[PDB]
Amino acid sequence: PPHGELQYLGQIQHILRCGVRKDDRTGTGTLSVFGMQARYSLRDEFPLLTTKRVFWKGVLEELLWFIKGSTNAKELSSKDLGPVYGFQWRHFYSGQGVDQLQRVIDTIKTNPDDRRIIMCAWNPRDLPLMALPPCHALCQFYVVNSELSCQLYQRSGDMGLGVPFNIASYALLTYMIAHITGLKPGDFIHTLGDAHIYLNHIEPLKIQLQREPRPFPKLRILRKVEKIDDFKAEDFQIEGYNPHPTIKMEM
Amino acid sequence: PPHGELQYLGQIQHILRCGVRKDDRTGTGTLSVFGMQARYSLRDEFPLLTTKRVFWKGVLEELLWFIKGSTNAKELSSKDLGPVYGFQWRHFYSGQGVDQLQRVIDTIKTNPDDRRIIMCAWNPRDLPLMALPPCHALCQFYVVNSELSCQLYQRSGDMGLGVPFNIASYALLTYMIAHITGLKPGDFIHTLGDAHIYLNHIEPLKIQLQREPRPFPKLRILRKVEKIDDFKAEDFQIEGYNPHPTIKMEM
Numbered sequence: 001p002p003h004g005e006l007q008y009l010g011q012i013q014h015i016l017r018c019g020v021r022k023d024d025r026t027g028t029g030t031l032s033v034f035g036m037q038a039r040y041s042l043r044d045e046f047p048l049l050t051t052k053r054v055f056w057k058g059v060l061e062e063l064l065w066f067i068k069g070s071t072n073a074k075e076l077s078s079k080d081l082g083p084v085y086g087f088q089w090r091h092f093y094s095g096q097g098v099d100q101l102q103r104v105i106d107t108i109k110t111n112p113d114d115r116r117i118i119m120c121a122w123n124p125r126d127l128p129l130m131a132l133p134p135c136h137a138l139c140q141f142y143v144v145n146s147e148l149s150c151q152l153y154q155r156s157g158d159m160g161l162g163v164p165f166n167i168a169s170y171a172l173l174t175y176m177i178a179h180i181t182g183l184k185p186g187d188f189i190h191t192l193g194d195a196h197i198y199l200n201h202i203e204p205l206k207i208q209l210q211r212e213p214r215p216f217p218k219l220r221i222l223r224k225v226e227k228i229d230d231f232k233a234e235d236f237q238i239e240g241y242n243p244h245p246t247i248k249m250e251m
Numbered sequence: 252p253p254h255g256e257l258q259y260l261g262q263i264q265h266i267l268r269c270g271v272r273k274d275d276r277t278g279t280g281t282l283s284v285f286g287m288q289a290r291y292s293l294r295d296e297f298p299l300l301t302t303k304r305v306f307w308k309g310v311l312e313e314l315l316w317f318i319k320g321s322t323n324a325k326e327l328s329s330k331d332l333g334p335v336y337g338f339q340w341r342h343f344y345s346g347q348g349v350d351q352l353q354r355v356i357d358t359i360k361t362n363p364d365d366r367r368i369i370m371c372a373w374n375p376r377d378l379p380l381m382a383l384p385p386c387h388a389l390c391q392f393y394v395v396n397s398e399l400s401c402q403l404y405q406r407s408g409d410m411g412l413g414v415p416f417n418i419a420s421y422a423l424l425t426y427m428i429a430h431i432t433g434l435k436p437g438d439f440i441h442t443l444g445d446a447h448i449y450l451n452h453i454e455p456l457k458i459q460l461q462r463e464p465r466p467f468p469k470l471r472i473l474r475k476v477e478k479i480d481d482f483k484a485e486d487f488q489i490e491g492y493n494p495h496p497t498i499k500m501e502m
């Protein structure tokens with residue numbers, strides 16, 4: 001079985017070769033392809049990329065912050081709001097609004113075959129801009145044979161910085177939900193609309209491309225946890241993570 | 252360049268071999284895989300499948316009906332509400348609610364680089380069921396180099412009946428929007444969550460698999476059209492459609 005990270009490497013390669021020039025909101029140069037998908041197994045492994053060191057601690061901490069429902073930006077001082085944007089996962093507050101995350105968990109428990117196990121995230125800058133603002137990301141969950149799978153659709157994906165961080169974030173989220181629903185993690189599927197590489201990330205990425213992936217690490221949850229709000233950073237241990245060196249993509 | 256329909260055939264094959272048994276809402280047997288994607292070129296061709304005759308007339312007529320915003324079910328007598336569900340494309344009436352379709356068209360015109368060119372469809376049975384009900388489908392548009400591309404994400408896809416019909420529907424929609432925005436059709440990308448085959452469709456599909464695709468036909472728009480509401484069925488001509496025989500999938 002080939003290494004899942006090869007998908008990510010192949011997508012970078014594909015964008016470098018066939019990507020077309022396209023400006024973003026601020027007009028600052030990307031190579032762009034529309035429509036991509038990769039599948040990462042979560043079965044006795046965890047897709048924390050190995051061709052560069054991924055900031056796992058920030059992944060964990062930021063996900064925990066989102067599961068809390070916190071809007072205090074400084075409440076996230078664990079030592080530009082993207083790329084996960086989980087601000088409306090819990091409320092739209094101790095009972096005000098729909099709780100998307102809790103609804104996902106309950107549906108998985110009350111009707112695992114449901115095709116509507118879906119949670120959305122919005123870029124907060126979009127909210128005052130218009131009514132019925134489009135989500136930045138939709139997350140769909142899926143259960144078969146006691147395995148929980150997750151598919152993330154992002155309307156756009158920064159391949160150098162955001163994507164590897166998002167792969168780890170939603171994989172971690174899936175591990176958490178599986179844990180509290182008594183299921184085993186299955187697949188994480190990552191699907192993009194506008195998949196793009198910033199011009200200034202090109203050379204660093206060309207170097208990363210020449211690196212050989214190493215076996216993905218494992219994620220262990222060290223305690224028995226009951227409710228999604230109960231997880232702490234200390235309950236998690238990444239083991240066997242042997243990545244190539246950090247790459248600084250200069251945003 | 253291999254025939255795009257081969258993607259569809261390969262996905263059927265993949266579901267037959269690796270699909271797992273999963274019940275739907277009514278509990279009536281499918282083989283299921285989670286997460287799929289196919290890309291169909293719209294450049295001087297139109298992805299109306301050839302390994303069985305696709306009911307083009309119903310495709311066109313139903314899309315036109317949705318663009319109208321009609322809720323009179325009998326208003327669609329052009330001779331179970333799925334699989335497109337375009338009921339909220341225009342209103343949520345001559346000015347009441349967000350007009351998703353018109354907003355897509357305007358954004359394409361006022362800011363073609365926008366990553367938020369998105370329109371959603373809901374299964375109407377979901378609406379009274381809960382607040383913030385998940386869409387059945389999200390449709391994202393994308394513009395580069397005067398080409399309009401479209402990606403449809405469906406939370407679930409009936410591979411035998413719904414999928415081929417949806418491929419033609421969203422391809423047609425893309426042709427229409429391109430026409431009125433002065434762009435050329437690019438790619439239609441079809442992405443599924445729960446991609447599935449009903450048990451009773453298996454044998455018919457196994458037979459369809461042994462059929463060789465023929466070149467896709469072309470779609471011609473016969474008149475110069477200005478606003479999306481102005482299209483009529485008569486403005487469209489499918490040419491060079493030489494499909495294998497009709498296959499009845501017995502729902």
Ligand SMILES: O=C(C[C@@H]1S/C(=N\N=C\c2ccccc2O)N=C1O)Nc1cccc(C(F)(F)F)c1
Binds near residue numbers: 055077165
């Ligand atoms: O600096 C960031 C940016 C993070 S990091 C990120 N994406 N990371 C990608 C990434 C990280 C490590 C290795 C490879 C990667 O691609 N997205 C974010 O929102 N977050 C942050 C972390 C700690 C503290 C602070 C604060 F609060 F601003 F000081 C911010």
Ligand SMILES: O=C(C[C@@H]1S/C(=N\N=C\c2ccccc2O)N=C1O)Nc1cccc(C(F)(F)F)c1
Binds near residue numbers: 332333
């Ligand atoms: O019977 C249908 C079902 C259509 S057809 C469809 N999907 N078609 C798939 C398909 C069609 C032709 C060939 C191959 C296919 O896979 N989905 C639908 O909603 N629609 C219809 C058409 C005309 C008239 C009526 C009415 F109003 F009920 F009488 C309904």
